[PDB]
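Input structure tokens:
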């Protein structure tokens, strides 16, 4: 609504930092407790920054305050009373989707020492996929371009609820999923289309390509896209027109949906609304009802 345009400010007393979650692109990310909003939250910090860096922090808060949807990680507001500056987000119960997918994969089931996890079902994969596509419909409606859509950037809550966020990790500290394109910028090439790699053009359509890769991650239980390849080999495949293989178990319509995300020409890719409609329909016809363990 119109009120979400205005950033909510939070009192410093109401935030208690607990532990570091990882190094972010502009500062440390912490698990914290938040009172009068106790609940667990994740906070992004900005320590002893310049005037321009603090200006950018408020501009990012003004962007996020207005992105509020059922399938978008909740932004609660900021605290700029002291140093560091703090951005507050919800801390989801079941962590990141990439870890979740791997924890429910055939290998995790086979290697479990005690009580095994349940292998993620096709119905559960469809349910996760439709929620991510729903969040992407919302972000496109807001003219927001994500640029780093991947399962590691999705979070899982209770009742297999899934939301899209962006941890915004330091790409220099954690370089596994990033490549220094042109020797200049760290970018997530394995999830990117040819125009984003070659011309650094990011749009709703390059996010659609990434969504296709996220569907591939879901149906492969969180495997790294193009895991058989070096970064330079990945770039050669993407720019030449080779595609990720069909997951062992995937509805054929779902693999064809992925292929539709991977059209070389951005304007010829499947439209986000259509992707969401198809996944929503498949998920409703194969609902989630089995218990999920481990
Ligand atoms: C564009 O809309 C956006 C909405 C939210 C965000 C912030 O995203 C995040 C902010 C913090 C975290 C950290 C985090 C880790 N584990 C769990 N369990 N919950 C968390 N919170 C993860 C995030 O995304 C995966 C970025 C963009």
């Amino acid at each position: 609504g119109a009120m979400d345009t205005f950033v909510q400010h939070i009192k410093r007393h109401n935030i208690v930092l607990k532990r570091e979650l990882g190094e972010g692109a502009f500062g440390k990310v912490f698990l914290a407790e938040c009172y009068n909003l106790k609940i667990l939250v994740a906070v992004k910090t900005l320590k002893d920054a310049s005037d321009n860096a603090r200006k950018d922090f408020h501009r990012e808060a003004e962007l996020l305050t207005n992105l509020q949807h059922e399938h978008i990680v909740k932004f609660y507001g900021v605290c700029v009373e002291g140093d560091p500056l703090i951005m507050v987000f919800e801390y989801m119960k079941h962590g990141d989707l990439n870890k979740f997918l791997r924890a429910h994969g055939p290998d995790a089931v086979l290697m479990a020492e005690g009580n095994p996890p349940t292998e993620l079902t096709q119905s559960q994969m469809l349910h996760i996929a439709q929620q991510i596509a729903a969040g992407m419909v919302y972000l496109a409606s807001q003219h927001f371009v994500h640029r780093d859509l991947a399962t590691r950037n999705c979070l899982v809550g209770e009742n297999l609820l899934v939301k899209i966020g962006d941890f915004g990790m330091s790409r220099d500290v954690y370089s596994t999923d990033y490549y220094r394109v042109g020797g200049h910028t760290m970018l997530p090439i394995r999830w990117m289309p040819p125009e984003s790699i070659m011309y650094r053009k990011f749009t709703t359509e390059s996010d659609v390509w990434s969504l296709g890769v996220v569907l591939w991650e879901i149906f492969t239980y969180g495997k790294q896209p193009w895991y058989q390849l070096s970064n330079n080999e990945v770039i050669e495949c993407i720019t030449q027109g080779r595609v990720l293989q069909r997951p062992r178990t995937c509805p054929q319509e779902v693999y064809e949906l992925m292929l539709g995300c991977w059209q070389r020409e951005p304007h010829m890719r499947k439209n986000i609304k259509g992707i969401h409609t198809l996944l929503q329909n498949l998920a409703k016809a194969s609902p989630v009802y089995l218990d999920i363990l481990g």
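The CA atoms of residues 109 and 233 lie 31 Å apart. The longest helix spans residues 122-141.
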